């Protein structure tokens, strides 16, 4: 069966997980100011994840051909959702329900989260793992993941954008590609396209919960200054 052209391009724009892991692992060796040292390392890791996500958005087809005011507005709207989705798909590729995989490749056991994390983080992780299980049951592959990511990037009410017809095109074009792909390849357990969209709704709800967790840490004054994610949290 054929594959939509928009997906095939999104596949070739995807950075391989090894060079992103090395770049992030390499940036975590750079020295910094002390005052927990692992909490500081995890914040920086998440930060570097968001940088390579911006680097991915910069290379995409419709995003590149967009002026800066619109580029910023899109990313400001979808940043945590793109971070959550990146974590989720990592867990899909990491088929181990007893632990979570980090972008650096280190595994953290769920038992470790359950006794060392607060309720908010632990809730947030368990909820995310529930979505991981549903995506594995729906047999999420890489063609849809790339398509999903591109839908998240542009899934914004068109009022807030200036180069508006360019964006409208993208949304329809990405929905049709995901529709066309799931119909030819997954015709067995119901409306895959619809189920995947229902996942988008859950990724949005997870990303708000994630934003609430950052706000909790922020009120605790435990968040390192200059942190990229809390600066995103405030625009």
């Amino acid at each position: 069966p054929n594959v939509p052209e928009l997906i095939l391009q999104l596949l070739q724009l995807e950075p391989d997980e090894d060079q992103v892991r090395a770049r992030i692992l390499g940036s975590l060796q750079e020295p910094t100011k002390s005052r927990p040292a692992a909490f500081g390392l995890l914040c920086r890791m998440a930060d570097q994840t968001f940088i390579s996500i911006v680097d991915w958005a910069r290379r995409c087809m419709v995003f590149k051909e967009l002026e800066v005011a619109d580029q910023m507005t899109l990313l400001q709207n979808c940043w945590s959702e793109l971070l959550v989705f990146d974590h989720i798909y990592r867990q899909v590729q990491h088929g181990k329900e007893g632990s979570i995989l980090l972008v650096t490749g280190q595994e953290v056991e769920l038992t470790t989260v359950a006794t060392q994390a607060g309720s908010l983080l632990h809730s947030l992780v368990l909820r995310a793992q529930e979505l991981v299980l549903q995506l594995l049951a729906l047999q999420l592959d890489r063609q849809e993941f790339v398509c999903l990511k591109f839908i998240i990037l542009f899934s914004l009410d068109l009022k807030f954008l200036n180069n508006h017809i360019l964006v409208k095109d993208a949304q329809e074009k990405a929905n049709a590609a995901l529709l066309d792909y799931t119909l030819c390849h997954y015709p067995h357990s119901g409306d895959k396209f619809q189920q995947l969209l229902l996942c988008l709704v859950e990724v949005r709800a997870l990303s708000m919960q994630a934003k609430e967790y950052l706000y909790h840490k922020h009120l605790g004054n435990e968040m390192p200054r200059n942190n990229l994610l809390i600066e995103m949290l405030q625009a």
Partner: peptide
């Protein structure tokens, strides 16, 4: 003034 912008308008 902004951070996102900085990242966006970066090398290459």
């Amino acid at each position: 003034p902004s951070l996102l912008k900085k990242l966006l308008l970066a090398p290459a």
